Amino acid sequence: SGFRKMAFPSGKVEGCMVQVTCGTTTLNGLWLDDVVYCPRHVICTSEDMLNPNYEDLLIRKSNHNFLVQAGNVQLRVIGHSMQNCVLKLKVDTANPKTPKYKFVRIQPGQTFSVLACYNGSPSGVYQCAMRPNFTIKGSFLNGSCGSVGFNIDYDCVSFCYMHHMELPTGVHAGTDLEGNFYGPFVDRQTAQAAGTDTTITVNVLAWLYAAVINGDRWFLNRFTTTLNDFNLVAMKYNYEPLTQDHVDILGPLSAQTGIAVLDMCASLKELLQNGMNGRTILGSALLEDEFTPFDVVRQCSGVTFQ
Amino acid sequence: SGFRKMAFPSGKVEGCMVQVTCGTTTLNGLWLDDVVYCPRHVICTSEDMLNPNYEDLLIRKSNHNFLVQAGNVQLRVIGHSMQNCVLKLKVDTANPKTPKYKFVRIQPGQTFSVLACYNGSPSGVYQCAMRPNFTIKGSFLNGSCGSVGFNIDYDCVSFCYMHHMELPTGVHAGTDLEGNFYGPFVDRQTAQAAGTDTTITVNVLAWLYAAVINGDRWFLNRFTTTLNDFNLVAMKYNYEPLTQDHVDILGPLSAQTGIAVLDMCASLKELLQNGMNGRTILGSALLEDEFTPFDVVRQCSGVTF
């Protein structure tokens, strides 16, 4: 029993974290095989961040301008190239700790673990969701750039996020490992803002199924609804629309608990219209949207990664 | 910016997890140097659990009855001993991945990371706290026994908890790494129940200071309180008493934000009376008590917004 915001075990990623220094700037890099991946803004000064021409800045750098430290060992940079907003530093040593891995781009609503790092040293691990507005509500201070997000499937690490910046509201923006930003952001000092966010409906429903599995049933009712009527109510409370794909994905949880997805939607409608009335669900007074249907099934079944 | 329930990176502990088998029972063990530590109830059947005589069950076992698997490698048990509720299996190979470590016993209110494991394989990592009633609100299924709790301040792992059982309310009980239980619990299937739990006041105060550091002051008020008047109110809401030790420990957060501890105590009294009125604090609609003063200082910026 119990239900916690659980991250993947971080060891396979810890063995890839390095420190990248260039000029005044020090940030984190990801060392996989003989390449170190890091944000391309490591080559910028504070003045450069206003109007940066990254090719012009890069052409002026020699391999020896990039100092890469893996633990207490200095790596030798033997090449450099740029891919979108990610800098790739070719090094003379393949990482002996390189796990089986893939670079994957995730969709809003999908969750992943973040290994927060400073000076190439991992400091913490937490779970988070890619918001519908493409930001993440992370916990990052200055020096955290280059920290990565990932998921694990069997023994394979799927890297999905690299941290680049903090927006004015305190939320975070970054890229996939191919350097494509999540959201309409740019890697420079200009007026940028997180757009209006919405709640991840399919994830709230998954978490309501997790609560039922854990014995919290007070919110259940005899009613059902239609996908069309539910979506009219979801639009009113700034919830993302629920699709037939979301209903299909929740099929296993519906069969296990005996509560159809539209039966749970009627519970969710009543919760939106009435509130919790002093009660909590899984120890929360808010409707939690950072657990996917897969996360719920995994945590309620004990899937392992050795 | 931001404030998350953050766990320590788990790699140093993942390299110590092994599977321990004794007859039909399989659970997790912690392999440090040449010793594997695990719950002694691995030697029990379900019938043995009502009133097990562990000394009598253990004397009937030999080294070769314990099967220890580290990854896909079978370790050889060359000795065994019981220390309180933990079994220590001496093995013929020192763990090459043994980190720098210590065994520490924690007090209620302390937080730690749990690496949940099944069959010697890590499945997930989360943060939790030793409740005032000595239980932990974990997320554990059958097969999780032997999973450990730890902190990694600097590069040394301080192991503080080993999981032994789930109580009837769904909460969890276990021991330190010397096998002493936290709380009045026993590794017996007998009528045992978690006592009435309370809120960790010093941790709620720390988290209110974290909210002020991150830029939020809506809950502050113009009042102060004596320590005794605060305690008289807080206990009416099932909050733990705040001691002078707690006030002293909050000193650094008070100096950083400019808000005296007893002034933050007045704010907490008002929140307990009024609720949040549709507002949230650090993304929560409840008062959070699983961040200690030390956790707030470690995670938050040293510059208040």
Ligand SMILES: CCN1CCN(c2ccc(NC(=O)CN3Cc4ccc(Cl)cc4[C@H](C(=O)Nc4cncc5ccccc45)C3)cc2)CC1
């Ligand atoms: C709740 C109220 N808060 C909201 C957030 N706010 C704030 C003020 C200033 C900055 N940034 C800088 O000073 C320079 N950056 C420019 C910049 C441009 C573009 C790119 Cl691609 C990267 C960067 C880098 C950056 O954003 N770094 C980071 C990343 N994560 C957390 C970080 C945490 C703190 C300061 C940097 C942080 C440096 C960021 C946030 C304060 C008030």
Ligand SMILES: CCN1CCN(c2ccc(NC(=O)CN3Cc4ccc(Cl)cc4[C@H](C(=O)Nc4cncc5ccccc45)C3)cc2)CC1
């Ligand atoms: C209101 C909802 N209720 C529903 C009922 N529930 C519940 C909790 C525990 C068990 N335990 C067993 O069946 C056998 N254990 C006896 C036992 C005795 C003594 C000792 Cl020292 C260890 C053990 C071991 C044990 O507790 N294992 C574990 C550990 N962690 C989580 C675990 C999660 C599930 C089943 C085992 C779990 C096996 C049964 C039902 C509580 C919540």
Ligand SMILES: [Cl-]
């Ligand atoms: Cl302690």
